[PDB]
Design a protein around this ligand. Structure first.
Ligand SMILES: CC(C)(COP(=O)(O)OP(=O)(O)OC[C@H]1O[C@@H](n2cnc3c(N)ncnc32)[C@H](O)[C@@H]1OP(=O)(O)O)[C@@H](O)C(=O)NCCC(=O)NCCSC(=O)C[C@@](O)(CC(=O)O)C(=O)O
Ligand SMILES: CC(C)(COP(=O)(O)OP(=O)(O)OC[C@H]1O[C@@H](n2cnc3c(N)ncnc32)[C@H](O)[C@@H]1OP(=O)(O)O)[C@@H](O)C(=O)NCCC(=O)NCCSC(=O)C[C@@](O)(CC(=O)O)C(=O)O
Lengths: 616, 616, 78
């Protein structure tokens, strides 16, 4: 039928990635008992792909296309386009959609579209027998069949205003917000709207109020016409002329807003672009008087609009023109979790706890302390580690010992396992992060990661009362190396000055070094056997950290036991040595190093015999 | 006061990790407007630590202790223990709690506790002036003050039965479920219960009904006593004797269930352990008659219990003994998300989509196909990769080509970057996973990860119409190596039989090898310049995979373009080469290899001068 | 548990391994390699699935995290 704009079979494209509007349309389709969604595809100029949304409680996928012609070719059944383009692109996108043979209706939401562009869109629509609703409108809706984007708001409002089933009222306004208020007014004073359209408030619209009023006049389902206009322009005079020419025979309720204008200055431009009475004819008074004289049902003010609707509907009901129908079942829809959570209706437990930092407020917190206060107090990198790892604001000398360790272990040449693996990955053309992790993954019991075990084993020996000789003897009997003892290149003949530097700092600044004194006694015994069995840098860090925690006053015996048991201290070597690993990776990139392959002459290939692989 | 069991200041321990019971107690404390939770700590014999729960909508932490003495010493203010221990440990845990000077009340939930154990608990409680509620009970509650575990169920039931404010009724039963039904009956026929206790259904309880009835008689807030007993045992005769001795002056409503017993066989043992009338005196008839004769308000049947409550309450109200009070404000609590979701009240969008497998049903699915059908059809490892990576059930020869590639690239000796790094990490004592990832992170443009780029560059050259000589020439001008060309040890003089094996398979089984033919023409030109510029194994895999996808009929031109653009094919080398990496790691562990340190004689140390580091 | 236990039965009964060889396999830890190798198929599949889906950067929702900072008193002493 030519008079029908939208029906329950209407398929549409949504131009612009407006996820809320998309969900609102789908929610209406669901409560109206539609078999399939009213949206065939989304036109997203920035990206083609998929969009996930709800169909009641079930999630569905909507296809997303970059252009209007690509979407139209994929879904030729879609004849409506809900255009959310900005005022900067509303004209070219509407004109592109109007040039598509399969698109018949375009709803232009954008405010601020030039009057000339709207004139050209309106003329293009009239020439091609198409419809432009807008610009500067929410759209409109056919009750129980289709909604344009955000028209009629929340599903709660749709249910309260009974918009999931059609009535007998054909409604048209200029205002988008007043179209929703009118849906409420009409539902309370009649069987509700059949269809409602807001043409927008621009003085040159894509479609005039009369275009829609003439469709309502042809539609047999509509027995009552209602409209709400405003001052400025001569749109309402098209209706009054049609009313005088007997082109509108159905009873028409009409009200023109802007009665305030003569009381206020002539220069006042109202909200809508077209709401400014340039001539006397353009005023609300001249329009409401001409409406009264044409035979329309005009109320005393906007306050008695619903009462006039009630009077006209009741008249049709008594005369038999309109028939009373049974109210269909009230539809239901699940509430969005975010709404139920915001209103305090529901609670949901957290899966994780975080006690070391908080990024969720106005300012980042490290163990409850604002980053600003950490920096103003010059806590430094050692103080940041005190907060994030230990949840303590450490004494200055304890934060400086952490920084001293980082500098001392930053690098120990390219030959060590971690630096060697990071260099091989860098020579293989790997990025910095992959190369770094390739080297960090060698940190363990033999290379670097002996700190936790040195702290653990020396603390146990000294605490359980073992004499240094008994500890050395016990570990040998178990076949277990003493962690923190031994080195590949450092020895009695080649002393490790890093160990000396850590020991001088602890002697000058720690209130006590009892575990260090015990460790040095163990070292005298091990080096007496083999010169390479020195207290290495990992053993030195672990042992000194126990003395630091024991003597600084900031840790209880339980806290120290927890630190030892959980393994914090290897983190210091990983963090410090990452400086040298990144340096070695960058050095190989600057050198333009080639791919490494280990020389064959350094590998003894010793394959098993055929006999060996056949049995045991 | 000696008559008060629990008040709004009562603090309790929950023995057993019963998270639902813990939440129910906290929810009651919250709706009763308590300042702090009624639970001081949880006793979890398996673990000490923390438990996170709600206080309205806010999350709080409750401490968890391994033993009763440790919890009691930490929270001496807690005088109640809600014991959820099984019947196997209910006695020893209740006896341990009773031996604690600070614990006064123990509620024993367990069913199936020996009669002898209950006799000893009851006597121990009486000797120490303590209270044992149970065994085999939900507990009880003081309206508006404290609840034992699960007593009175959901917050909805607490609100419907007005249990957040005290009434004038002192209630006691044997049955736990009937205690909740009674709370509903009493609330509808009076001002509700002040306190209600279920002593359990065992024939030797920790506390008899009279113990609680005597406390209600001393309490001035209670003006009415109500009780519901049952057949078996002589508990109710203690009440009737106290009623006869004028020890209970307040009006008492009483009903003894089990009137069915004489109609049924004498051998029938009812639900509760103590519900079996051994003698005539133990029957419901003898008990209800003795109650009637003692002056109690006994109904005709259980049906008129609420009516008897209504009669006794109304009598007190007219006589002025009980005063009408104003109903306090109805408390509120947020619904648990899981309940709102189950009832369909709310919906919540998913963050992720998964299209390749589903583990959430009765059987694991790989791209929609049941694992059982994958195995019954002998799709093999190649068929599993077809499903999980390509979402296709591939032709058999295509799945076998994937398996052939995995075997061919499984290992290429210990000298290559990935195997070398995995060996160094294994020599450093690293676990298998760390060592494996150390080696996998070398896979990139020079080692292994050239497959995607070989497929990309050869496909582009052949598609855009470049002659092999023009492609070789163009790449040289851009200073870009041709990916899939060149090798460290394989060359014209040392041919790569792996490349030959892949080429023979494709010639025997692929409908076409056009990209391979083009690649071999490029190889003739590169090897003419330098013998090491052969088509390597990575170039061979990438090029042949394009021919496989192009000719097998299972992929559209778009699907092939997507595979090339996204980079699937390097995954084949990572997967295949992981076999040899794991092998090299295990080989070094079997060999007992020592920590590696790269020899100094293989490194030229070339430090910058002091002048170089001071300026540019 | 099923893979580890069955692999011991396989090694014990196939005739290809001596008691010492089986003890060495158990002590050194070979069998977790089977899960790393097998599960790499699904890991690569999940990585590729997210690339095909055009998935955006993930950030764990704040509503799933209880931020419980220590007090100033807690960070000053023990
Ligand atoms: C360091 C090394 C692997 C050396 O191994 P080797 O392969 O040379 O020696 P092994 O084959 O194990 O044995 C040789 C003989 O001495 C005996 N023997 C050896 N160590 C013994 C011991 N700890 N306790 C008792 N006895 C021992 C053994 O029992 C045998 O004697 P015997 O039985 O009579 O034949 C080894 O000592 C060891 O594991 N130490 C413990 C782990 C440790 O603390 N790691 C941290 C080192 S700091 C670091 O990683 C940072 C670094 O400084 C690194 C760098 O620069 O290199 C940097 O900043 O980068
Ligand atoms: C393979 C290698 C890094 C070798 O590098 P090299 O360091 O020896 O050579 P470069 O220093 O780059 O240059 C030497 C001279 O030849 C020229 N030239 C070299 N390659 C050239 C080329 N592709 N296109 C044009 N020209 C080239 C260059 O322009 C210069 O000539 P000139 O300028 O005149 O002085 C190199 O070819 C390369 O990057 N190829 C592309 C990446 C690639 O496909 N990788 C996969 C290899 S299969 C694999 O990884 C698996 C493996 O088989 C590994 C194993 O077993 O080892 C296993 O199973 O484990």
């Amino acid at each position: 039928k030519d008079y029908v704009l939208f029906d329950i079979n209407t398929k549409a494209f949504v131009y612009g990635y407006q996820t809320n509007a998309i969900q609102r349309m789908l929610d209406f389709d669901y409560v109206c008992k539609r078999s399939s969604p009213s949206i065939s595809a989304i036109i997203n100029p920035s990206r083609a792909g998929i969009h996930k949304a709800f169909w009641g409680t079930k999630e569905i996928i909507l296809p997303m296309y970059k252009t209007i012609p690509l979407a139209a070719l994929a879904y030729p059944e879609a004849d409506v386009m809900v255009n959310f383009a900005s005022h900067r692109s509303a004209f070219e996108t509407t004109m592109e959609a109007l040039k598509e043979d399969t698109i018949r209706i375009v709803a232009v939401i954008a405010e601020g579209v030039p009057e000339r562009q709207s004139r050209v869109m309106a003329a293009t629509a009239r020439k091609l027998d198409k419809i432009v609703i807008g610009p500067a409108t929410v759209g409109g809706m056919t009750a129980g069949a289709f909604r344009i984007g955000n028209t009629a708001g929340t599903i709660e409002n749709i249910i309260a205003s009974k918009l999931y089933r059609p009535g007998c009222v054909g409604f048209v306004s200029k205002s988008g917000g007043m179209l929703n208020e009118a849906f409420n007014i009409i539902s309370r004073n009649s069987d509700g709207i059949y269809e409602g359209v807001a043409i927008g408030g621009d003085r040159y619209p894509g479609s005039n109020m009369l275009d829609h009023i003439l469709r309502y006049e042809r539609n047999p389902a509509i027995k009552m016409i209602a409209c709400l206009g405003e001052l400025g322009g001569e749109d309402e005079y098209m209706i009054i002329q049609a009313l005088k020419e007997k082109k509108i025979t159905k009873p028409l309720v009409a009200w023109v807003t802007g009665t305030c204008s003569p009381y206020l200055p002539a220069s006042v431009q109202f909200g809508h672009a077209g709401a400014k009475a340039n001539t006397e004819k353009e005023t609300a008074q001249a329009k409401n008087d001409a409406f009264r004289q044409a035979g329309a049902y005009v109320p005393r003010s906007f306050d008695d609009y619903g009462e006039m609707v009630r009077q006209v509907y009741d008249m049709l009901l008594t005369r038999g023109i309109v028939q009373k129908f049974d109210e269909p079942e009230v539809p239901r829809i699940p509430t969005d979790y975010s709404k139920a959570l915001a209103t305090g209706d529901i609670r949901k437990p957290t899966t994780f706890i975080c006690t070391i930092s908080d990024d969720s407020g106005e300012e980042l917190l490290y163990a409850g302390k604002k980053l600003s206060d950490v920096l103003d107090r010059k806590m430094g990198i050692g103080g940041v580690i005190g907060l994030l790892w230990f949840k303590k604001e450490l004494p200055e000398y304890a934060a400086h010992f952490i920084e001293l360790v980082i500098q001392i272990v930053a690098d120990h040449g390219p030959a060590v396992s971690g630096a060697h693996n990071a260099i091989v990955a860098s020579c293989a053309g790997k990025d910095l992060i992959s190369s770094l992790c390739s080297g960090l993954l060698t940190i363990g019991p033999r290379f670097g990661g002996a700190i936790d075990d040195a702290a653990r084993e020396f603390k146990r020996a000294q605490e359980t009362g073992l004499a240094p000789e008994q500890f050395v003897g016990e570990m040998k009997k178990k076949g277990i190396n003493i962690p923190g003892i031994g080195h590949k290149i450092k020895s009695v003949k080649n002393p490790d000055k890093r160990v000396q530097l850590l020991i001088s700092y602890a002697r000058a600044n720690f209130p006590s070094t009892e575990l260090l004194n015990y460790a040095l006694q163990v070292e005298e015994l091990t080096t007496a056997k083999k010169g390479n069995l020195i207290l290495n840098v990992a053993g030195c860090i672990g042992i000194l950290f126990i003395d630091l925690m024991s003597s600084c006053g900031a840790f209880s015996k339980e806290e120290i036991d927890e630190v030892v048991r959980l393994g914090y201290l290897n983190g210091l070597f990983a963090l410090g040595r990452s400086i040298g690993l990144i340096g070695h990776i960058l050095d190989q990139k600057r050198l333009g190093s080639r791919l490494y392959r280990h020389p064959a002459e350094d590998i003894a290939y010793m394959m098993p015999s055929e006999e060996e692989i056949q049995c045991k």
